[PDB]
Each structure stands twice: as structure tokens, then as C-alpha cells.
Amino acid sequence: HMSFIKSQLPIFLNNCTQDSVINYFQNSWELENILMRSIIDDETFYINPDPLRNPLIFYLGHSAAFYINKLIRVELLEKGINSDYEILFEFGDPENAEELNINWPDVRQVWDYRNKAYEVILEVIKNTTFDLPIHASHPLWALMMGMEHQRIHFETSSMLLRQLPTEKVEKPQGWQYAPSQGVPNTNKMILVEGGTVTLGKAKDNPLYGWDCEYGDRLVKVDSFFASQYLVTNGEFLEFINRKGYETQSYWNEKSWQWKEENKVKNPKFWQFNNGKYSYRAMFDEIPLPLDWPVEVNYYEAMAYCGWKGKGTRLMSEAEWNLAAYGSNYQVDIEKVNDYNLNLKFGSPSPVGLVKTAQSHSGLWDLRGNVWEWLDENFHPLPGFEPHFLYEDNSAPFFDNNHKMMLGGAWVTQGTETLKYYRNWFRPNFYQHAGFRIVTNH
Ligand SMILES: CN(C)[C@@H](Cc1c[nH]cn1)C(=O)O
Ligand SMILES: [Cl-]
Ligand SMILES: [Fe+3]
Ligand code: NA
């Protein structure tokens, strides 16, 4: 599996020494540099490959600016590097390309700002006492935030690069896709015994987390059936061949309108040619990996559920937590090595290939491989409180227009690989995300 490109595991707040944080910081930055350096021509930075997101030049400077602004806010920095850039590269969620649709700086100028910002932050780390443990009311929380924010944008930007033509990107040395064993095994429904789970994260938990992660909610989860694997490309191919995209009964009025307006006939990263479907990995087009989890948005996942019928649905946040972590929990960061997470592979993996990736529930790849959609409107947990460093992180998206996803993907790094991270997206948006199907009986 992908070894030459290595991502350092997250660190508990009680072990965030200066040395370890220096290493984690350097790894966070170098990884984004590798991805950004995969764009061959600088003119390509002014393309917005995703019609719902900004140009790539924005994301070149966004992670660096975020560091500086948060450090300034906690007064670990007395001044920034470029106030204009710190404004331009700050504001990052439209429902249409029209809504989404400024004079951007040159590519060299943004790289220069990145380089200056890196050295500035490194000096802050080398000249600040790391009095253990770090915590939410500690100024260094701003640094923890920036490093996790940079790693999140490694993922979001990977999606942008995937939407660029293959001829405009260059695969980094060591990038390695998972294998394909061909046709997938049978996807059996597994009974997940009912139980009670506690959602949320305590304020004194020794791990960095975003505001929406914190709170406390007990939820009694009734037993339910779930597919042992995420729905595979092969399984979704059947849905297509049975006219899944052409039968309104499987969709709803909102989802059908999306599909028609975007003239969708297949998942975003499939392409039909010569009687066969090709599939777009990060940097190359390859024969469709039939045993990999299918990558779809929420509308498409629900259309598949509609074709399956019989009340087929998606899990709730509580249902996923029960299946993944049970009713018990002390996080063991080393367990991230047991799942397709943290760049073990540079791609999705065949369901069940990572033999260490079966949860005690019997379900495979609940953690890792690809994010999995949930029928759960993004919402606060009892006890939620915005953090002064980033009050608009999650609160504006408690609007019943965002569905959640959990577990992490092959590209996911940092604290986002662990139990408490809560993810969300508009249901039409594409990520490294798939789904599994659920029935109550
Ligand atoms: C979690 N996710 C929906 C955010 C993560 C993020 C990026 N920058 C700030 N928050 C986004 O992609 O907008
Ligand atoms: Cl764990
Ligand atoms: Fe951001
Ligand atoms: Na998953």
C-alpha cells in the first residue's frame, strides 16, 4: 500500500510537545505542497474545476491564511504577512453554480506568501512554551485548528484536482492506487443489535476537535439491518443497467431536477466509451474497479435505495456510531492503521481488502475507504458552543439543507480520522463518499 507518501498520525493534547508538533506541522504542510505541486501549468490555478467552489488559486493560499488569522486572534502573532491576502483567502457553500459565479493574485505571489507563512509559524512554534496539556482555552488551540484545517483542505482540494483533465495534473512520486480483485463478493445484510449510544465529546477530552463535535446526547438505537460492505461500483452498475437514472419512481422531484439539469447518466467519475465504463482516479482514468465502493452524492444514494425498495434507507448518525463503536470509549490513534485512512492507499480500496477494517458489528469499512452518507440533517448536540476563534464554523449550516457523513476516507488525515469528527455536505455535492444500505426488517 501507499508508503512513499506518509501522513503522520494525530497526537493527544497531553503529548503535544514542541518537537512532535513541529513534525506534525511540517507533515501537514508538505502533504498539501505535494498535492498543489501536481498542477502542471499555473494558468490552471484560475480554473474552478468544481462549479460550486472557488478557483484553485484560492485554495493554494487559503490554508496558509487560516493559520495566520487564527494565530493573530490569540495574539501569538503581532502582525500578519499580507493583510489583503489574509482577507481574500479567508471566506470559503452555494446551492447553484450561478450563485457561486475578484482580481486574483499571481501563482508565484501566492506560493511566496505560503513560504513566508510557513517560516513565520515555525518560529512561533519554536519560540512558544508547549505547557502540557494543550486545551481549548489555551492559545495554541489556534495552531491545532490550523493544522487540522490544512489537512481537511488536502481532502477538499483533492476533489478539485480529480475534476481537472488528466493532462493538467501530474501524479506525485509514490502515489499508489489500491488494487482491484474484479467482481465483488456478495453484499449480505447484517443485523446490528440495538443499544444505547452516547454522541458527542467532552470539553476535557484530550484531542483537538471542532465545535460541532462537542456535546452529550444519549440515543436508544433499535436493532437494524445493514449491508456488510459499502455499495460497490458493480452493484451500482446494475442499478444503471436497470434504468435507475431514468425511472422517476426511484427519485424525488428535487433529486430528479438536479439529475436532469446536470444531464447525469452515471456517477460523476465514470465515463462510458467503447461499450465500457472508465473510472477517474486522482490522476489517471482506469477500468472501472468493480469491487471498490461507488462514489455518489446523497441524491444518487437515495435513488439506489428507491430501486432496492422495501423501505431501504440510510443510517442515522446514532446508527453509524452504534455499528462502528458500540455501546461502550478510549480512542487508540494507532487503530487508524487498521483502516483505509491516512493515505494507506491513494484511492478507494476493494471492500473487505483491508482485513483489519471489520468493525465488531461485522460491518466492513465503517471507518475509512470512503466517507459514507447518512440520513441525518447536520444539527447541534446538547451542549454545543461556538469557539471564539471560528464562530461561523458549523452554526450557519444547521439549516436542514446539509446531510452528514462519517467514518473518513482514504485521503482523510488528522483528528478527522477519529471518533468525534462530524462531517456534512449539501446533498448534491460530491466528495470521496459512498454509502451502505439499511433496512429495519
Ligand atoms: C466540514 N466541511 C463541510 C467544511 C470543512 C471546512 C473547510 N474550511 C472550513 N471548514 C467545508 O468543506 O467547508
Ligand atoms: Cl479508536
Ligand atoms: Fe477553509
Ligand atoms: Na466508511
Short mmCIF file of C-alpha atoms and ligand atoms in Angstrom, two decimals:
data_model
loop_
_atom_site.label_atom_id
_atom_site.label_comp_id
_atom_site.label_asym_id
_atom_site.label_seq_id
_atom_site.Cartn_x
_atom_site.Cartn_y
_atom_site.Cartn_z
CA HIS A 1 0.00 0.00 0.00
CA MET A 2 0.99 3.64 -0.44
CA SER A 3 4.21 4.00 1.59
CA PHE A 4 6.33 6.67 -0.11
CA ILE A 5 3.77 9.38 0.76
CA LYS A 6 3.39 9.20 4.55
CA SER A 7 0.99 11.12 6.80
CA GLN A 8 1.81 11.47 10.49
CA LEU A 9 -0.88 10.31 12.90
CA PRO A 10 -2.62 12.81 15.21
CA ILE A 11 -1.31 13.43 18.72
CA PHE A 12 -3.10 13.62 22.06
CA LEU A 13 -3.16 17.08 23.63
CA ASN A 14 -1.24 15.71 26.64
CA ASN A 15 1.62 14.68 24.31
CA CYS A 16 1.75 17.79 22.08
CA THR A 17 5.40 18.53 22.72
CA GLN A 18 7.18 21.19 20.68
CA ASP A 19 9.15 18.52 18.81
CA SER A 20 6.12 16.38 17.96
CA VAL A 21 4.03 19.39 16.92
CA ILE A 22 6.86 20.64 14.71
CA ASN A 23 6.86 17.25 12.99
CA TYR A 24 3.07 17.17 12.65
CA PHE A 25 3.04 20.75 11.33
CA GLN A 26 5.77 20.08 8.76
CA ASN A 27 3.98 16.91 7.61
CA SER A 28 0.66 18.75 7.28
CA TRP A 29 2.25 21.43 5.07
CA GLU A 30 4.47 19.19 2.95
CA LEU A 31 1.48 16.99 2.11
CA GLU A 32 -0.52 19.94 0.76
CA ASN A 33 2.56 21.13 -1.14
CA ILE A 34 2.76 17.73 -2.85
CA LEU A 35 -0.88 17.93 -3.93
CA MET A 36 -0.67 21.56 -5.08
CA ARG A 37 2.57 20.85 -6.97
CA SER A 38 0.69 18.25 -9.06
CA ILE A 39 -0.84 21.03 -11.18
CA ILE A 40 1.43 21.36 -14.21
CA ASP A 41 0.52 24.81 -15.58
CA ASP A 42 -0.02 27.87 -13.40
CA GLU A 43 -2.89 29.05 -15.61
CA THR A 44 -4.81 26.03 -14.31
CA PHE A 45 -4.97 27.60 -10.83
CA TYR A 46 -7.52 30.13 -12.16
CA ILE A 47 -9.91 27.39 -13.23
CA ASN A 48 -12.60 26.42 -10.72
CA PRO A 49 -12.91 22.70 -11.61
CA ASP A 50 -15.92 22.31 -9.29
CA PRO A 51 -18.63 24.79 -10.38
CA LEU A 52 -19.70 25.08 -6.72
CA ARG A 53 -16.25 26.04 -5.35
CA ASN A 54 -13.71 28.82 -5.84
CA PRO A 55 -10.73 28.78 -8.23
CA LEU A 56 -7.75 26.66 -7.25
CA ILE A 57 -5.64 29.77 -6.58
CA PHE A 58 -7.92 30.46 -3.61
CA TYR A 59 -7.15 27.05 -2.11
CA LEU A 60 -3.42 27.49 -2.69
CA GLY A 61 -3.39 30.36 -0.19
CA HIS A 62 -6.42 29.55 1.95
CA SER A 63 -4.74 27.12 4.35
CA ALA A 64 -1.79 29.45 4.98
CA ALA A 65 -4.03 32.48 5.58
CA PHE A 66 -6.14 30.46 8.02
CA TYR A 67 -3.08 29.75 10.18
CA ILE A 68 -2.08 33.43 10.31
CA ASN A 69 -5.57 34.75 11.08
CA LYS A 70 -6.21 32.34 13.96
CA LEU A 71 -2.74 32.92 15.42
CA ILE A 72 -3.30 36.69 15.24
CA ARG A 73 -6.63 36.22 17.03
CA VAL A 74 -4.95 34.54 20.02
CA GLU A 75 -2.15 37.12 19.88
CA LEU A 76 0.55 34.53 19.25
CA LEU A 77 1.34 36.76 16.24
CA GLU A 78 1.51 40.56 16.41
CA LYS A 79 1.06 41.02 12.64
CA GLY A 80 0.34 39.03 9.51
CA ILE A 81 2.22 38.80 6.23
CA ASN A 82 -0.26 40.35 3.77
CA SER A 83 -3.48 41.84 5.15
CA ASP A 84 -5.10 41.89 1.70
CA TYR A 85 -4.30 38.21 1.10
CA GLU A 86 -5.47 37.38 4.63
CA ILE A 87 -8.82 38.89 3.61
CA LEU A 88 -9.05 37.50 0.08
CA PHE A 89 -8.04 33.94 1.05
CA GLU A 90 -10.33 33.84 4.13
CA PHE A 91 -14.00 33.49 3.16
CA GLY A 92 -14.71 30.00 1.85
CA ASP A 93 -21.35 26.95 0.15
CA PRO A 94 -23.69 27.69 -2.76
CA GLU A 95 -26.61 25.59 -3.94
CA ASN A 96 -26.06 26.52 -7.61
CA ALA A 97 -23.15 27.42 -9.85
CA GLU A 98 -24.93 30.70 -10.66
CA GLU A 99 -24.81 31.87 -7.05
CA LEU A 100 -21.13 30.93 -6.84
CA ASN A 101 -20.29 32.59 -10.16
CA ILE A 102 -12.37 39.34 -7.71
CA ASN A 103 -8.87 40.01 -9.05
CA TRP A 104 -6.76 37.00 -8.05
CA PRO A 105 -3.00 37.31 -7.43
CA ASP A 106 -0.40 35.52 -9.50
CA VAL A 107 0.53 31.94 -8.65
CA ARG A 108 4.11 32.85 -7.75
CA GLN A 109 2.88 35.52 -5.32
CA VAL A 110 0.67 33.01 -3.50
CA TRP A 111 3.49 30.46 -3.28
CA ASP A 112 5.67 33.24 -1.86
CA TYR A 113 3.01 34.01 0.75
CA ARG A 114 2.83 30.31 1.64
CA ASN A 115 6.61 30.13 2.07
CA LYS A 116 6.71 33.22 4.28
CA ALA A 117 3.75 31.98 6.32
CA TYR A 118 5.41 28.59 6.88
CA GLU A 119 8.56 30.19 8.30
CA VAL A 120 6.55 32.59 10.47
CA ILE A 121 4.50 29.78 12.02
CA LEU A 122 7.60 27.62 12.53
CA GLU A 123 9.17 30.47 14.52
CA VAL A 124 6.03 30.77 16.66
CA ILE A 125 6.25 27.06 17.47
CA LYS A 126 9.98 27.20 18.23
CA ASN A 127 9.53 30.27 20.46
CA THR A 128 6.37 29.27 22.37
CA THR A 129 6.30 27.15 25.51
CA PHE A 130 4.27 23.97 24.99
CA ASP A 131 2.99 23.61 28.56
CA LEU A 132 1.20 20.26 28.53
CA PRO A 133 -1.67 19.55 28.22
CA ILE A 134 -2.94 21.83 25.46
CA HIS A 135 -6.65 22.64 25.68
CA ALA A 136 -9.47 24.66 24.16
CA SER A 137 -8.81 27.74 26.30
CA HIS A 138 -5.06 27.60 25.51
CA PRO A 139 -3.68 29.96 22.82
CA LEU A 140 -2.09 27.01 20.99
CA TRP A 141 -5.60 25.74 20.17
CA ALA A 142 -5.31 28.16 17.24
CA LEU A 143 -2.36 26.12 15.93
CA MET A 144 -4.16 22.80 16.41
CA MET A 145 -7.09 24.33 14.50
CA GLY A 146 -4.90 25.46 11.61
CA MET A 147 -3.17 22.10 11.19
CA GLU A 148 -6.47 20.20 11.16
CA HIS A 149 -7.90 22.83 8.80
CA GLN A 150 -5.00 22.35 6.39
CA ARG A 151 -5.50 18.58 6.37
CA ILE A 152 -9.23 18.97 5.73
CA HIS A 153 -8.38 21.09 2.68
CA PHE A 154 -5.93 18.49 1.41
CA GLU A 155 -9.08 16.37 1.05
CA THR A 156 -11.35 19.08 -0.38
CA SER A 157 -8.68 20.14 -2.88
CA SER A 158 -8.04 16.53 -3.93
CA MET A 159 -11.63 16.54 -5.20
CA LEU A 160 -10.91 19.69 -7.21
CA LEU A 161 -7.83 18.14 -8.84
CA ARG A 162 -9.82 14.99 -9.68
CA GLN A 163 -12.24 17.17 -11.66
CA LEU A 164 -9.39 18.57 -13.77
CA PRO A 165 -8.45 16.82 -17.04
CA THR A 166 -5.77 14.17 -16.55
CA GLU A 167 -3.44 16.07 -18.89
CA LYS A 168 -3.33 19.05 -16.50
CA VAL A 169 -2.11 17.12 -13.43
CA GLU A 170 0.97 15.01 -12.69
CA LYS A 171 0.84 12.08 -10.28
CA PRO A 172 3.31 12.59 -7.40
CA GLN A 173 6.08 10.06 -6.88
CA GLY A 174 4.81 7.27 -4.66
CA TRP A 175 1.10 7.82 -5.23
CA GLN A 176 -0.33 4.30 -5.33
CA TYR A 177 -3.91 3.27 -6.02
CA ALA A 178 -5.36 0.21 -4.34
CA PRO A 179 -5.70 -2.97 -6.42
CA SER A 180 -8.90 -4.39 -7.86
CA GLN A 181 -9.77 -8.07 -7.41
CA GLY A 182 -12.54 -7.80 -10.02
CA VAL A 183 -16.15 -8.68 -9.20
CA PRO A 184 -17.10 -8.03 -5.55
CA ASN A 185 -18.21 -10.61 -3.04
CA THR A 186 -21.89 -10.86 -2.16
CA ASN A 187 -23.06 -7.91 -0.05
CA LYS A 188 -25.07 -9.53 2.74
CA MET A 189 -27.32 -7.67 5.17
CA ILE A 190 -26.05 -7.89 8.77
CA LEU A 191 -28.20 -7.44 11.86
CA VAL A 192 -26.79 -4.73 14.15
CA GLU A 193 -28.09 -5.42 17.66
CA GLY A 194 -29.87 -2.48 19.23
CA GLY A 195 -28.32 -0.50 22.04
CA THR A 196 -27.83 2.91 23.60
CA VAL A 197 -25.02 5.20 22.43
CA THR A 198 -23.67 8.49 23.74
CA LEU A 199 -22.97 11.03 21.00
CA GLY A 200 -20.61 13.97 21.44
CA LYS A 201 -17.27 14.77 23.03
CA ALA A 202 -16.42 16.12 26.47
CA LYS A 203 -14.81 19.53 26.80
CA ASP A 204 -11.81 17.99 28.61
CA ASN A 205 -11.26 15.25 26.02
CA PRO A 206 -7.50 15.09 25.27
CA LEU A 207 -7.88 15.54 21.49
CA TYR A 208 -8.45 18.56 19.30
CA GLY A 209 -11.96 18.84 17.92
CA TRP A 210 -14.24 21.32 16.19
CA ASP A 211 -17.15 22.96 17.98
CA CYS A 212 -19.84 20.77 16.38
CA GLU A 213 -18.11 17.68 17.83
CA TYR A 214 -18.79 18.63 21.46
CA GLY A 215 -21.92 17.89 23.45
CA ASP A 216 -23.73 14.98 25.05
CA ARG A 217 -26.73 13.03 23.73
CA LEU A 218 -27.94 9.58 24.73
CA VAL A 219 -29.83 7.83 21.91
CA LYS A 220 -31.58 4.47 22.16
CA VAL A 221 -30.96 2.77 18.81
CA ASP A 222 -33.26 -0.08 17.80
CA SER A 223 -31.70 -3.05 16.03
CA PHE A 224 -31.38 -2.69 12.27
CA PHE A 225 -30.03 -4.48 9.21
CA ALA A 226 -27.10 -3.02 7.27
CA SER A 227 -25.07 -4.19 4.28
CA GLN A 228 -21.70 -5.58 5.35
CA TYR A 229 -19.99 -3.65 2.54
CA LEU A 230 -20.41 -0.19 1.12
CA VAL A 231 -22.32 -0.38 -2.16
CA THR A 232 -19.79 -1.29 -4.85
CA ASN A 233 -19.31 0.05 -8.36
CA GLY A 234 -20.52 -3.32 -9.64
CA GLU A 235 -23.70 -3.11 -7.57
CA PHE A 236 -24.39 0.42 -8.83
CA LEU A 237 -23.74 -0.70 -12.41
CA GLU A 238 -26.76 -3.00 -12.07
CA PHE A 239 -28.83 -0.02 -10.88
CA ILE A 240 -27.81 1.82 -14.06
CA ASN A 241 -28.50 -1.16 -16.33
CA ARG A 242 -31.96 -1.44 -14.75
CA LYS A 243 -32.72 2.16 -15.82
CA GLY A 244 -32.06 3.61 -12.38
CA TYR A 245 -31.35 7.12 -13.68
CA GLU A 246 -34.44 7.04 -15.95
CA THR A 247 -37.22 5.98 -13.52
CA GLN A 248 -38.78 8.86 -11.60
CA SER A 249 -40.28 6.45 -9.05
CA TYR A 250 -36.79 5.90 -7.59
CA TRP A 251 -36.12 9.65 -7.21
CA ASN A 252 -37.96 12.67 -5.85
CA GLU A 253 -38.82 15.96 -7.52
CA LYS A 254 -35.80 17.78 -6.08
CA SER A 255 -33.34 14.97 -6.86
CA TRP A 256 -34.76 14.43 -10.37
CA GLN A 257 -34.43 18.16 -11.11
CA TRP A 258 -30.75 18.03 -10.11
CA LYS A 259 -30.10 15.00 -12.33
CA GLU A 260 -31.88 16.46 -15.36
CA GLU A 261 -30.35 19.94 -15.05
CA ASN A 262 -26.90 18.31 -14.87
CA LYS A 263 -27.74 15.68 -17.54
CA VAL A 264 -26.49 12.91 -15.25
CA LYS A 265 -26.48 9.34 -16.58
CA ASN A 266 -23.90 7.77 -14.24
CA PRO A 267 -21.72 8.59 -11.23
CA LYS A 268 -19.57 11.68 -11.68
CA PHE A 269 -16.26 9.84 -12.10
CA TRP A 270 -17.47 7.21 -14.58
CA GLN A 271 -17.22 7.66 -18.35
CA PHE A 272 -18.72 5.36 -20.98
CA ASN A 273 -16.57 4.67 -24.04
CA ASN A 274 -16.16 1.63 -26.31
CA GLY A 275 -19.04 -0.19 -24.63
CA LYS A 276 -17.23 0.01 -21.29
CA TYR A 277 -17.10 2.34 -18.29
CA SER A 278 -13.81 4.00 -17.42
CA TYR A 279 -13.21 5.43 -13.94
CA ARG A 280 -11.28 8.55 -12.97
CA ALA A 281 -8.91 8.07 -10.05
CA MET A 282 -6.95 11.10 -8.81
CA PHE A 283 -4.59 11.28 -11.80
CA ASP A 284 -5.48 8.53 -14.30
CA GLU A 285 -8.50 7.00 -15.99
CA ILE A 286 -8.68 3.25 -15.40
CA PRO A 287 -11.07 0.35 -15.98
CA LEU A 288 -13.99 0.60 -13.58
CA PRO A 289 -12.91 -1.06 -10.28
CA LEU A 290 -15.98 -3.21 -9.72
CA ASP A 291 -15.14 -4.08 -6.10
CA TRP A 292 -14.45 -0.51 -4.96
CA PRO A 293 -17.17 1.44 -3.13
CA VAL A 294 -19.24 3.55 -5.52
CA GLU A 295 -18.77 7.30 -5.12
CA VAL A 296 -22.06 9.23 -5.31
CA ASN A 297 -23.90 12.16 -3.78
CA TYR A 298 -26.86 11.85 -1.42
CA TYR A 299 -29.45 12.09 -4.21
CA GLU A 300 -27.88 9.13 -6.02
CA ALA A 301 -27.58 7.05 -2.85
CA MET A 302 -31.29 7.58 -2.19
CA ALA A 303 -32.20 6.71 -5.79
CA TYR A 304 -30.38 3.39 -5.30
CA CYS A 305 -32.34 2.86 -2.09
CA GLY A 306 -35.52 3.59 -4.04
CA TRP A 307 -34.63 0.97 -6.64
CA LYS A 308 -33.96 -1.52 -3.84
CA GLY A 309 -37.36 -0.70 -2.34
CA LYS A 310 -38.62 -2.47 0.78
CA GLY A 311 -38.11 0.64 2.88
CA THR A 312 -34.39 0.63 2.07
CA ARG A 313 -32.74 3.68 3.62
CA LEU A 314 -29.53 5.16 5.02
CA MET A 315 -28.27 5.12 8.59
CA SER A 316 -28.67 7.85 11.18
CA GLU A 317 -25.67 9.30 12.99
CA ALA A 318 -26.58 7.24 16.06
CA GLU A 319 -26.96 4.08 13.97
CA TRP A 320 -23.50 4.53 12.45
CA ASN A 321 -21.96 5.17 15.88
CA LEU A 322 -23.53 2.01 17.31
CA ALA A 323 -22.29 -0.13 14.42
CA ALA A 324 -18.82 1.45 14.44
CA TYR A 325 -18.06 1.89 18.15
CA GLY A 326 -20.80 0.03 20.02
CA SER A 327 -22.46 0.98 23.28
CA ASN A 328 -19.26 1.34 25.32
CA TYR A 329 -14.50 4.57 24.87
CA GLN A 330 -10.77 5.33 24.82
CA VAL A 331 -9.55 6.27 21.34
CA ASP A 332 -6.37 4.46 20.23
CA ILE A 333 -4.81 6.54 17.46
CA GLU A 334 -2.76 3.58 16.22
CA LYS A 335 -6.02 1.89 15.19
CA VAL A 336 -6.15 4.31 12.25
CA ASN A 337 -3.59 1.97 10.65
CA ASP A 338 -6.29 -0.75 10.59
CA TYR A 339 -8.50 1.04 8.04
CA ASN A 340 -8.09 2.66 4.62
CA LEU A 341 -7.35 6.02 6.23
CA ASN A 342 -4.47 8.48 6.41
CA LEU A 343 -3.12 7.68 2.93
CA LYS A 344 -2.68 3.95 3.42
CA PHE A 345 -3.85 3.97 -0.21
CA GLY A 346 -4.10 6.84 -2.68
CA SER A 347 -7.54 5.63 -3.70
CA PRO A 348 -10.62 3.74 -2.50
CA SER A 349 -9.99 0.08 -1.75
CA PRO A 350 -11.90 -3.11 -2.58
CA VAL A 351 -14.48 -3.66 0.14
CA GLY A 352 -13.01 -6.12 2.62
CA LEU A 353 -9.44 -5.96 1.29
CA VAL A 354 -8.06 -4.41 4.49
CA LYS A 355 -8.63 -7.45 6.71
CA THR A 356 -8.27 -5.26 9.82
CA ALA A 357 -11.16 -2.99 8.77
CA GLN A 358 -14.16 -5.02 10.01
CA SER A 359 -15.87 -3.41 12.99
CA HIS A 360 -17.05 -5.62 15.84
CA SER A 361 -20.57 -5.23 14.44
CA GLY A 362 -19.40 -7.22 11.41
CA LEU A 363 -19.66 -4.27 9.02
CA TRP A 364 -16.65 -3.51 6.82
CA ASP A 365 -15.12 -0.08 6.17
CA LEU A 366 -17.42 1.80 8.52
CA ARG A 367 -14.16 3.67 9.15
CA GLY A 368 -12.09 4.51 6.08
CA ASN A 369 -12.22 3.72 2.37
CA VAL A 370 -14.78 6.44 1.62
CA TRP A 371 -16.97 8.71 3.71
CA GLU A 372 -20.49 7.31 3.97
CA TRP A 373 -23.64 9.39 3.67
CA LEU A 374 -26.20 9.34 6.49
CA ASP A 375 -29.87 10.33 6.51
CA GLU A 376 -29.17 12.95 9.17
CA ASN A 377 -29.57 16.70 8.82
CA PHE A 378 -26.49 18.39 10.28
CA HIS A 379 -27.52 19.61 13.73
CA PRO A 380 -26.03 20.59 17.11
CA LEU A 381 -25.66 18.20 20.03
CA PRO A 382 -26.84 19.31 23.51
CA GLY A 383 -24.01 21.42 24.92
CA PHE A 384 -22.80 22.84 21.60
CA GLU A 385 -20.93 26.14 21.83
CA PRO A 386 -19.17 28.07 19.03
CA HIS A 387 -15.47 28.71 19.62
CA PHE A 388 -14.35 32.33 19.65
CA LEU A 389 -11.66 31.54 17.07
CA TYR A 390 -14.22 30.43 14.45
CA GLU A 391 -17.81 31.19 15.43
CA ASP A 392 -19.18 30.50 11.92
CA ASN A 393 -17.64 27.02 11.60
CA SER A 394 -20.86 25.00 11.93
CA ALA A 395 -23.69 27.18 13.27
CA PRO A 396 -24.71 28.58 9.83
CA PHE A 397 -25.17 25.04 8.46
CA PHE A 398 -27.80 23.89 10.97
CA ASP A 399 -30.32 24.70 8.24
CA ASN A 400 -31.88 21.34 7.25
CA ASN A 401 -30.11 21.66 3.87
CA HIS A 402 -26.99 19.62 4.77
CA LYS A 403 -26.71 15.84 5.20
CA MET A 404 -23.99 14.26 7.32
CA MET A 405 -21.25 11.74 6.54
CA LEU A 406 -18.91 9.88 8.88
CA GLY A 407 -16.01 7.44 9.07
CA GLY A 408 -13.31 9.12 6.99
CA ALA A 409 -11.89 8.20 3.60
CA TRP A 410 -8.52 7.06 2.23
CA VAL A 411 -7.50 10.73 1.94
CA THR A 412 -8.64 11.70 5.45
CA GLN A 413 -5.95 12.62 7.98
CA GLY A 414 -5.51 14.02 11.48
CA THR A 415 -8.20 14.15 14.14
CA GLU A 416 -10.72 13.83 11.29
CA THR A 417 -9.80 10.12 11.22
CA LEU A 418 -11.11 9.60 14.77
CA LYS A 419 -14.43 9.03 16.52
CA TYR A 420 -15.63 12.55 17.27
CA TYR A 421 -15.32 14.30 13.89
CA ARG A 422 -18.71 15.17 12.36
CA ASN A 423 -18.88 15.90 8.62
CA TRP A 424 -21.61 17.44 6.48
CA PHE A 425 -22.35 18.49 2.90
CA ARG A 426 -25.20 19.67 0.71
CA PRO A 427 -26.86 16.55 -0.74
CA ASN A 428 -25.90 17.31 -4.37
CA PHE A 429 -22.18 17.75 -3.62
CA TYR A 430 -19.51 15.18 -4.45
CA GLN A 431 -16.81 14.01 -2.04
CA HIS A 432 -14.75 10.85 -1.59
CA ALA A 433 -18.02 9.43 -0.29
CA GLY A 434 -20.26 6.40 -0.79
CA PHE A 435 -22.92 4.64 1.22
CA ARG A 436 -24.29 1.39 2.59
CA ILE A 437 -27.96 0.41 2.64
CA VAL A 438 -30.15 -0.24 5.67
CA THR A 439 -33.48 -1.96 6.32
CA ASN A 440 -35.40 -2.04 9.59
CA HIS A 441 -36.57 -5.61 8.88
C1 LIG B 1 -16.64 20.10 7.09
N1 LIG B 1 -16.76 20.75 5.79
C2 LIG B 1 -18.16 20.79 5.38
C3 LIG B 1 -16.08 22.04 5.71
C4 LIG B 1 -14.65 22.00 6.28
C5 LIG B 1 -14.00 23.34 6.27
C6 LIG B 1 -13.08 23.86 5.41
N2 LIG B 1 -12.82 25.13 5.85
C7 LIG B 1 -13.56 25.33 6.94
N3 LIG B 1 -14.30 24.28 7.23
C8 LIG B 1 -16.05 22.61 4.28
O1 LIG B 1 -15.59 21.89 3.39
O2 LIG B 1 -16.50 23.75 4.11
CL CL B 2 -10.14 4.36 18.41
FE FE B 3 -11.49 26.63 4.94
NA NA B 4 -16.79 4.46 5.63
#
